[PDB]
Scaffold this motif. Structure first.
Motif, PDB file in Angstrom:
ATOM      1  N   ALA A 108       0.663  -1.265  -0.209  1.00 43.37           N
ATOM      2  CA  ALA A 108       0.658   0.042  -0.168  1.00 43.37           C
ATOM      3  C   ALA A 108       0.911   1.102   0.279  1.00 43.37           C
ATOM      4  O   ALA A 108       1.960   1.269   0.375  1.00 43.37           O
ATOM      5  CB  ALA A 108      -1.199  -0.052   1.193  1.00 43.37           C
ATOM      6  N   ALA A 109       0.180   2.003  -0.182  1.00 40.77           N
ATOM      7  CA  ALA A 109       0.840   3.479  -0.349  1.00 40.77           C
ATOM      8  C   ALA A 109       0.215   4.069   1.282  1.00 40.77           C
ATOM      9  O   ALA A 109      -0.246   5.172   1.416  1.00 40.77           O
ATOM     10  CB  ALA A 109       0.689   3.991  -1.638  1.00 40.77           C
ATOM     11  N   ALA A 110       1.302   4.840   1.863  1.00 41.67           N
ATOM     12  CA  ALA A 110       1.291   5.561   2.718  1.00 41.67           C
ATOM     13  C   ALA A 110       1.625   7.324   2.368  1.00 41.67           C
ATOM     14  O   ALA A 110       1.717   7.470   1.659  1.00 41.67           O
ATOM     15  CB  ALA A 110       2.322   5.760   4.306  1.00 41.67           C
ATOM     16  N   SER A 111       0.746   8.069   3.327  1.00 38.54           N
ATOM     17  CA  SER A 111       0.922   9.531   3.232  1.00 38.54           C
ATOM     18  C   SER A 111       1.801  10.845   3.886  1.00 38.54           C
ATOM     19  O   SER A 111       1.184   9.878   4.706  1.00 38.54           O
ATOM     20  CB  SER A 111      -0.557  10.271   2.096  1.00 38.54           C
ATOM     21  OG  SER A 111      -0.324  10.980   2.059  1.00 38.54           O
ATOM     22  N   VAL A 112       1.679  11.833   3.680  1.00 37.20           N
ATOM     23  CA  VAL A 112       2.293  12.992   4.256  1.00 37.20           C
ATOM     24  C   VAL A 112       1.106  13.198   5.421  1.00 37.20           C
ATOM     25  O   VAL A 112      -0.341  12.844   4.538  1.00 37.20           O
ATOM     26  CB  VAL A 112       2.522  14.242   3.621  1.00 37.20           C
ATOM     27  CG1 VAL A 112       3.729  13.684   3.587  1.00 37.20           C
ATOM     28  CG2 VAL A 112       1.403  14.407   2.464  1.00 37.20           C
ATOM     29  N   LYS A 113       0.817  13.441   6.545  1.00 36.79           N
ATOM     30  CA  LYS A 113       0.007  14.061   7.687  1.00 36.79           C
ATOM     31  C   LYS A 113      -0.450  15.195   7.485  1.00 36.79           C
ATOM     32  O   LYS A 113      -0.823  15.498   8.389  1.00 36.79           O
ATOM     33  CB  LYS A 113      -0.753  13.357   8.259  1.00 36.79           C
ATOM     34  CG  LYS A 113      -0.542  11.018   8.548  1.00 36.79           C
ATOM     35  CD  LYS A 113      -1.549  10.741   7.482  1.00 36.79           C
ATOM     36  CE  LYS A 113      -3.264  12.300   7.820  1.00 36.79           C
ATOM     37  NZ  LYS A 113      -4.759  11.115   7.209  1.00 36.79           N
TER      38      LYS A 113
END
Ligand SMILES: [Ca+2]
Lengths: 6, 279
Positions: free
Chosen positions: A1-6
């Motif tokens: 999966a792809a994680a992202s800036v919060k």
């Protein structure tokens, strides 16, 4: 999966 | 020490009340500690880091921060004007591209890197990791953040920004690390901040001014912004001897301001990170 800036 | 007309979040985490404007702190200011900003990078040449910031690793063709997120997060850790820990050593690990995206494999490897790299860096007072990023629930991402934490790196992660319970996000949902929600200048929970039992702490997160690329500054909002206060506080408190890696999240919990915040749903700690400085 792809994680992202919060 | 006293820094006047300070960013509201630094003043808050040295204060027992809202609406004050002077950041108070011990002059040791995290000297001899190390923080790994695991993020989009760090514009390490920014005047605000004073040569205390290095890029150590990248998983892309460049190690430069081409987005801005990591430089901002790093500044709250330790920039001379916008940072909590104004003498800490900042190490950048670029796991996110310049659009703010990263595959989970990359994110795991980067946590693995820091678990080993700390043994090559002089950080005698302690090591801290800041992960202002997250995605959907992943046992492996969670396992990877446990593994860091276990390797004696106090690990502070963002709760996420969907206004929902953080149990369904990673690495937010890993019990062994320090999960950080956001609060605003009027001691409200941020409306976007996730919540739930896995949160350990809330730090300042709305309208956070910090360093940005090009030698610029700006204000942005997020738990991604809340997480760097606590890491820098974690790194500051470890240099004072007060606490260790294994135990700094709990210590920051015990000595946090209690009951100050509103807008907290039942089942979530009402605890806003506080530095406990009495001049
Ligand atoms: Ca914890």
């Amino acid at each position: 999966a792809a994680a992202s800036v919060k | 020490a006293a820094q006047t007309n300070a960013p509201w979040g630094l003043a808050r985490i040295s204060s027992t009340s809202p609406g004050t404007s002077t950041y108070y702190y011990d002059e040791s200011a995290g000297q001899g500690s190390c923080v790994y900003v695991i993020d989009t990078g760090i514009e390490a040449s920014h005047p605000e880091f004073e040569g205390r910031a290095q890029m150590v690793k990248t998983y892309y063709y460049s190690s430069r921060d081409g987005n801005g997120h990591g430089t901002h997060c790093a500044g709250t850790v330790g920039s001379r004007t916008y940072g909590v820990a104004k003498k800490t050593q900042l190490f950048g690990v670029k796991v996110l591209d310049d659009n703010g995206s990263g595959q989970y494999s990359t994110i795991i490897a980067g946590m693995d890197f820091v678990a080993s790299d700390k043994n090559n860096r002089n950080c005698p007072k302690g090591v801290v990791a800041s992960l202002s990023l997250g995605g959907g629930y992943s046992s492996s991402v969670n396992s990877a953040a446990a593994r860091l934490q276990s390797s004696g790196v106090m690990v502070a992660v963002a709760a996420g920004n969907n206004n929902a319970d953080a149990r369904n996000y990673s690495p937010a949902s890993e019990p062994s690390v320090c999960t950080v929600g956001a609060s605003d200048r009027y001691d409200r929970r941020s409306s976007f901040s996730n919540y739930g039992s896995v949160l350990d702490i809330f730090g300042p997160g709305t309208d956070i001014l910090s360093t940005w690329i090009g030698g610029s500054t700006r204000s942005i909002s997020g738990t991604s912004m809340a997480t760097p206060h606590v890491a820098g506080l974690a790194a500051y408190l470890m240099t004072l001897g007060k606490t260790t890696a294994a135990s700094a999240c709990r210590y920051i919990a015990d000595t946090a301001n209690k009951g100050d915040l509103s807008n907290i749903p039942f089942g979530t700690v009402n605890l806003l990170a506080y530095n406990n400085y009495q001049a």
